Design an enzyme around this catalytic site. Structure first.
Site, PDB file in Angstrom:
ATOM      1  N   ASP A  26      32.161  42.484  26.273  1.00 23.45           N
ATOM      2  CA  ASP A  26      33.616  42.677  26.712  1.00 23.45           C
ATOM      3  C   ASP A  26      34.132  41.517  27.546  1.00 23.45           C
ATOM      4  OD1 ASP A  26      35.957  43.845  27.289  1.00 23.45           O
ATOM      5  OD2 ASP A  26      35.205  45.884  27.825  1.00 23.45           O
ATOM      6  N   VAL A  27      34.749  40.891  26.854  1.00 23.60           N
ATOM      7  CA  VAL A  27      35.230  39.692  27.639  1.00 23.60           C
ATOM      8  C   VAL A  27      36.299  40.055  28.789  1.00 23.60           C
ATOM      9  CG1 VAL A  27      35.998  37.186  27.543  1.00 23.60           C
ATOM     10  CG2 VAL A  27      34.832  38.170  25.647  1.00 23.60           C
ATOM     11  N   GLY A  65      36.153  43.912  33.164  1.00 25.45           N
ATOM     12  CA  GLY A  65      36.294  44.521  34.373  1.00 25.45           C
ATOM     13  C   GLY A  65      35.102  45.565  35.052  1.00 25.45           C
ATOM     14  N   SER A 103      33.445  32.852  33.916  1.00 24.06           N
ATOM     15  CA  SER A 103      34.907  32.909  33.474  1.00 24.06           C
ATOM     16  C   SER A 103      35.015  32.791  31.989  1.00 24.06           C
ATOM     17  CB  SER A 103      35.574  31.585  34.188  1.00 24.06           C
ATOM     18  OG  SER A 103      36.630  31.165  33.510  1.00 24.06           O
ATOM     19  N   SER A 118      39.906  43.601  26.044  1.00 25.15           N
ATOM     20  CA  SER A 118      40.738  44.378  26.538  1.00 25.15           C
ATOM     21  C   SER A 118      41.706  44.061  27.567  1.00 25.15           C
ATOM     22  CB  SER A 118      39.874  45.789  26.638  1.00 25.15           C
ATOM     23  OG  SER A 118      40.429  46.524  27.251  1.00 25.15           O
ATOM     24  N   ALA A 119      43.026  44.240  27.096  1.00 27.96           N
ATOM     25  CA  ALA A 119      44.081  44.182  28.019  1.00 27.96           C
ATOM     26  C   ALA A 119      44.097  42.847  28.917  1.00 27.96           C
ATOM     27  CB  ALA A 119      44.262  45.199  28.867  1.00 27.96           C
ATOM     28  N   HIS A 136      47.313  39.417  27.494  1.00 27.24           N
ATOM     29  CA  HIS A 136      48.856  39.737  28.010  1.00 27.24           C
ATOM     30  C   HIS A 136      49.002  39.299  29.396  1.00 27.24           C
ATOM     31  CE1 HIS A 136      47.814  43.100  29.989  1.00 27.24           C
ATOM     32  NE2 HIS A 136      47.903  44.113  28.797  1.00 27.24           N
TER      33      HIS A 136
HETATM   34  N1  LIG Z   1      38.767  33.650  34.006  1.00 26.93           N
HETATM   35  C1  LIG Z   1      38.120  34.950  33.957  1.00 26.93           C
HETATM   36  N2  LIG Z   1      36.858  35.201  33.395  1.00 26.93           N
HETATM   37  C2  LIG Z   1      36.519  36.432  33.296  1.00 26.93           C
HETATM   38  N3  LIG Z   1      37.286  37.459  33.489  1.00 26.93           N
HETATM   39  C3  LIG Z   1      38.613  37.354  34.095  1.00 26.93           C
HETATM   40  C4  LIG Z   1      39.093  36.039  34.539  1.00 26.93           C
HETATM   41  N4  LIG Z   1      40.315  36.138  35.018  1.00 26.93           N
HETATM   42  C5  LIG Z   1      40.531  37.566  34.940  1.00 26.93           C
HETATM   43  N5  LIG Z   1      39.438  38.203  34.594  1.00 26.93           N
HETATM   44  C6  LIG Z   1      39.514  39.490  34.373  1.00 26.93           C
HETATM   45  O1  LIG Z   1      40.114  40.041  33.431  1.00 26.93           O
HETATM   46  C7  LIG Z   1      40.399  41.491  33.452  1.00 26.93           C
HETATM   47  C8  LIG Z   1      41.941  41.558  32.930  1.00 26.93           C
HETATM   48  S1  LIG Z   1      42.350  43.389  33.541  1.00 26.93           S
HETATM   49  C9  LIG Z   1      41.248  44.311  32.921  1.00 26.93           C
HETATM   50  C10 LIG Z   1      40.586  44.246  31.392  1.00 26.93           C
HETATM   51  C11 LIG Z   1      39.669  45.279  31.242  1.00 26.93           C
HETATM   52  N6  LIG Z   1      39.074  45.098  29.952  1.00 26.93           N
HETATM   53  C12 LIG Z   1      40.317  46.840  31.204  1.00 26.93           C
HETATM   54  O2  LIG Z   1      40.794  47.103  30.065  1.00 26.93           O
HETATM   55  O3  LIG Z   1      40.414  47.306  32.201  1.00 26.93           O
HETATM   56  C13 LIG Z   1      39.925  41.728  35.061  1.00 26.93           C
HETATM   57  O4  LIG Z   1      38.972  42.549  34.959  1.00 26.93           O
HETATM   58  C14 LIG Z   1      40.146  40.475  35.469  1.00 26.93           C
HETATM   59  O5  LIG Z   1      39.338  40.370  36.793  1.00 26.93           O
HETATM   60  C1  LIG Z   2      47.040  46.608  30.931  1.00 20.34           C
HETATM   61  O1  LIG Z   2      46.608  45.744  31.939  1.00 20.34           O
HETATM   62  C2  LIG Z   2      47.433  45.802  33.003  1.00 20.34           C
HETATM   63  C3  LIG Z   2      47.510  44.906  33.838  1.00 20.34           C
HETATM   64  C4  LIG Z   2      48.467  45.037  34.785  1.00 20.34           C
HETATM   65  C5  LIG Z   2      48.548  43.978  35.851  1.00 20.34           C
HETATM   66  C6  LIG Z   2      49.293  46.185  35.042  1.00 20.34           C
HETATM   67  C7  LIG Z   2      50.171  46.276  36.058  1.00 20.34           C
HETATM   68  C8  LIG Z   2      50.839  47.351  36.095  1.00 20.34           C
HETATM   69  C9  LIG Z   2      50.868  48.463  34.978  1.00 20.34           C
HETATM   70  O2  LIG Z   2      51.678  49.604  35.348  1.00 20.34           O
HETATM   71  C10 LIG Z   2      49.962  48.200  34.186  1.00 20.34           C
HETATM   72  C11 LIG Z   2      49.632  49.642  32.886  1.00 20.34           C
HETATM   73  O3  LIG Z   2      48.989  49.214  32.069  1.00 20.34           O
HETATM   74  O4  LIG Z   2      50.399  50.451  33.328  1.00 20.34           O
HETATM   75  C12 LIG Z   2      49.028  47.158  34.095  1.00 20.34           C
HETATM   76  C13 LIG Z   2      48.232  47.143  32.985  1.00 20.34           C
END
Ligand SMILES: Nc1ncnc2c1ncn2[C@@H]1O[C@H](CSCC[C@H](N)C(=O)O)[C@@H](O)[C@H]1O
Ligand SMILES: COc1cc(C)c2ccc(O)c(C(=O)O)c2c1
Ligand SMILES: Nc1ncnc2c1ncn2[C@@H]1O[C@H](CSCC[C@H](N)C(=O)O)[C@@H](O)[C@H]1O
Ligand SMILES: COc1cc(C)c2ccc(O)c(C(=O)O)c2c1
Lengths: 328, 328
Positions: B171-172, B175, B223, B238-239, B242
């Site tokens: 899971d790149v 989190g 990273s 995952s997310a 964007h």
């Molecule tokens: N350069 C980097 N290398 C690895 N992870 C990073 C990064 N920059 C940001 N991230 C991580 O990318 C994630 C994006 S938000 C959370 C994504 C998670 N898969 C979910 O769906 O909850 C965060 O955990 C942030 O800490």
């Molecule tokens: C999907 O990953 C993200 C990342 C950020 C930074 C977010 C900030 C505000 C939000 O409301 C959401 C959301 O999903 O609702 C959100 C989601």
């Protein structure tokens, strides 16, 4: 009534998106022949892709239209964003005007709610008045806005009260002189003077000159915290008291008491808690801007008392009220 | 839609008032016996007068109620402001959490619309990630919110795709490990690795130890711009995409491409244009936070191309989608 989602109720994306469109004058560019993001952007100095994204969000909100070719159009409601529209709303949202700039101070509401102190300084590093006092252009926009508020709220103010019987009226904090200009235009034998800081007072002067009222209307540069021109028939405080906390408010009222004497009248003109142009929203703006507050007819009374004045009347004029105070 | 005036549409007083109430936990103080301005204020450390003024504006909105004696009470809607509420909405509005703090970045939207650059920095003097990386408590709240977003959006994810077939998934940007924890719990022969920065990665580790998954779930601090643990059955994003502009997104996709080789599968999981929990609102949020953006299948595909990948499938799951990419 909240029949809309808590999180949506706290959305900042749309309010800010509208203010940004109002600032970039997007509606004007559209009605002027620029239809595509690329065009609007260049005409406004914005980043093409970013602007397109703002517009798409505003299309969803219901202010714009976007056709198959990416040709944007104004919705019936989006018309209100044009700078030439009747309601003159756009200038109130423009991040460049004093109000469009001060409103962003809400992003620091937490500070006011915790301390009871204004939030505007937290975001801009100085009071509102200090800001306008060091930025002449900014101060002018504020003058224009309050001038507009007069048309909006004081509709019919001329006849709603017996001004002529005053002879000479002093508009304490009268801005560009829009109110006095209206009172005198409707009362041939009436004369008065606008007392305000140098920016608005000079704007008031420029107006009386052009309006042809210099013979009856004069301006005086000064703070209403210091003594005012004495012995006038009436002193008007139009949308002033709500800009100040209780201590300052009595300070201002007190001065008016002194200048009014046992033979003058003090007229506080503003949206009293209850009026339709006086809501909790406005009350919070006064708090975040200067730590002021909207007041009930009862609360103005307490202030009057502490300044040796007593309410004698309270005539509702359209969306606001005129409370008349005289020597206790 | 425009069922409300333009200026009301641009109102900041209420969005901020709700966010401040959420931050002061007013609802929780009320449901816990403090029902008077003086009481609630004292329990939250606010200015009695100011708080009272905030609450009055909020009863008007429809979140609270107040009797003649000044006793405050929640409402069918104001109930969602309590922390213990099911929806778990309050934490998203809290000015202390990472998203309640980040959203205030919208007051600088203009900067983003003009330059295409993120607004967050304008307000906080540093990037979002830089900020979280230098403040562990802030980073922790963000992990919790993303964790909660998995419940809100990924409901069913476990079954909608053939995970077990991957053997080992990485899971790149995983989190604190919620997604992986959900995948492995549903598939007992599957194993994986969460790759994230220090903060989340250690949170993932702590999670796995306590939930007894350390035998199959492993954490790796790093990273995703640098090489990744190679030869996995599948790499999940995952997310994440964007959160990045086109260049960075491609960089990230490349790494996954490289680590996946000719036998792995790259899976992008996020609300694409069209899907729910995906809107112009979210798109502008991505723009003001990191200059990222919500993309369409079309748009992800162009990025996959620039990374030697190609969309092969796209299963919609709940309000999001799983875009399965493979090497060309
Ligand atoms: N350069 C980097 N290398 C690895 N992870 C990073 C990064 N920059 C940001 N991230 C991580 O990318 C994630 C994006 S938000 C959370 C994504 C998670 N898969 C979910 O769906 O909850 C965060 O955990 C942030 O800490
Ligand atoms: C999907 O990953 C993200 C990342 C950020 C930074 C977010 C900030 C505000 C939000 O409301 C959401 C959301 O999903 O609702 C959100 C989601
Ligand atoms: N210390 C001070 N002395 C005099 N005028 C002041 C002042 N501080 C602020 N003001 C003026 O008070 C006015 C309040 S807003 C405008 C009020 C005007 N009568 C109207 O209804 O349009 C502004 O013109 C502001 O410049
Ligand atoms: C009445 O005097 C004021 C003073 C200030 C500072 C205002 C600020 C924002 C506003 O929207 C209004 C308004 O009347 O609409 C306003 C009015």
């Amino acid at each position: 009534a909240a029949h809309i989602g808590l999180r949506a109720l706290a959305d900042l994306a749309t309010p800010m998106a509208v203010r940004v469109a109002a600032t970039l004058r997007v509606a004007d560019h559209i009605a002027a022949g620029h239809r595509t993001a690329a065009e609007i952007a260049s005409a406004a100095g914005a980043h093409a892709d970013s602007l397109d994204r703002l517009l798409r969000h505003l299309v969803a909100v219901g202010l714009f239209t976007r056709d198959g070719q990416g040709v944007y159009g104004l919705t019936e409601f989006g018309e209100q964003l044009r700078d030439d529209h009747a309601a003159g709303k756009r200038k109130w949202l423009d991040m460049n005007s004093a109000v469009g700039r001060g409103d962003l101070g809400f992003v620091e509401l937490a500070h006011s709610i915790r301390t009871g102190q204004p939030a505007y300084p937290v975001r801009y590093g100085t009071s509102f008045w200090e800001d306008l006092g060091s930025d002449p252009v900014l101060s002018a926009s504020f003058d224009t806005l309050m001038s507009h508020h007069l048309e909006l709220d004081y509709t019919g103010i001329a006849a709603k009260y017996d001004w002529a019987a005053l002879g000479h009226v002093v508009d304490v904090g009268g801005g560009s002189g829009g109110l006095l200009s209206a009172l005198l235009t409707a009362h041939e034998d009436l004369s008065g003077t606008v007392l305000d800081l140098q920016g608005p007072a000079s704007a008031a002067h420029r107006r009386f000159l052009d309006t042809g009222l210099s013979g009856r209307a004069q301006v005086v540069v000064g703070s209403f915290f210091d003594p005012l021109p004495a012995g006038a028939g009436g002193y008007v405080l139009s949308a002033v008291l709500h800009d100040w906390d209780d201590l300052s408010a009595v300070a201002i009222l007190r001065r008016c008491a002194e200048a009014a004497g046992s033979g003058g009248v003090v007229l506080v003109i503003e949206a009293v808690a209850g009026d339709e142009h006086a809501g909790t929203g406005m009350d919070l703006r006064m708090l975040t801007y200067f730590g002021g507050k909207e007041r009930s007819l009862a609360e103005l009374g307490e202030l009057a008392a502490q300044a040796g004045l007593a309410v004698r009347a309270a005539h509702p004029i359209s969306y606001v009220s005129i409370v008349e105070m005289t020597a206790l």
